[PDB]
Amino acid sequence: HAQTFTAAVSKTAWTWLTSLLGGSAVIIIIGLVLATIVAMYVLTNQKHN
Amino acid sequence: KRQRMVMKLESDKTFPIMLEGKINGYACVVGGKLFRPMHVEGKIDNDVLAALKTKKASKYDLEYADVPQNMRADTFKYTHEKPQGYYSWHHGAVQYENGRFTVPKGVGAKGDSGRPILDNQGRVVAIVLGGVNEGSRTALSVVMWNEKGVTVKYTPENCEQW
């Protein structure tokens, strides 16, 4: 058996790869959410009514 | 009679902004905070205020600065409330309605940005960054303060910078 395309090294390997690649995605999402809510904050501060 | 209104209007003074002997605008102080439009560049007439460190507002196109304590008494008083009617402005009375301030057409141009709007009692209601003529009147891109203690900039469509 020499077939090696995915060849999952370990559960720890995938766990770490998810941790350091995907957590950055979470931080990006948090930043986008903060930007959106502060944009709405500016909108309501200017004229909530 | 408008003569008494003009006399009351012409009482207080502001600090102009100079650029190579040219007055690109005015820099007023209200409530202990120094203000001047960011798009207008120059040197403030008074040296001391010109020495103050200021910070920029990306979406508000003006700078802000804290006046020294020993001079905060000599500042203009503000008003968050804006009753309907006409208000005194340096060039002339401002007739405002529907929350937007209008001036007679042909009044106000470049270099008139930052000049505060005074009420009947002299309290500053809002300051003007620019204006656009749209007919018999000329709407002004003024920035007002809300009752809760916030800052609002009512800018008309495709307004003109001053």
Residue B2 CA to residue A47 CA, distance in Å, equals: 34
Q: How far apart are the first and last CA of chain A?
A: 69
Q: Which residue of B has its CA nearest to A47?
A: B152
B136 catalytic residue (yes or no): no
B115 close to B128: Cβ distance less than 8 angstroms: yes
Resolution value in angstroms: 4.2
What is the distance between the alpha carbons of residues B66 and B75, in angstroms, rounded to a whole number? Answer: 11
**H or E stretch at B22:** strand B22-30
| DSSP assignments along B58-109, one per residue | TTT-EEEEEPPGGGTTS-BPB-S---SEEEEESSSEEEEETTEEEEETT---
Instruction: Give the determination technique.
Output: cryo-EM
Q: Confirm if B35 and B127 have CB atoms less than 8 A apart.
A: yes
Contact of B150 with chain A, judged by CB distance below 8 Å, is answered with: yes
> Is B98's Cβ below 8 Å from some Cβ in A?
no
For residues B49 and B41, the answer to whether their CB atoms sit within 8 Å is no
Is B61 one of the catalytic residues? Answer: yes
Amino acid type, A20: L
In chain B, the residue whose alpha carbon lies closest to the alpha carbon of A45 is B150
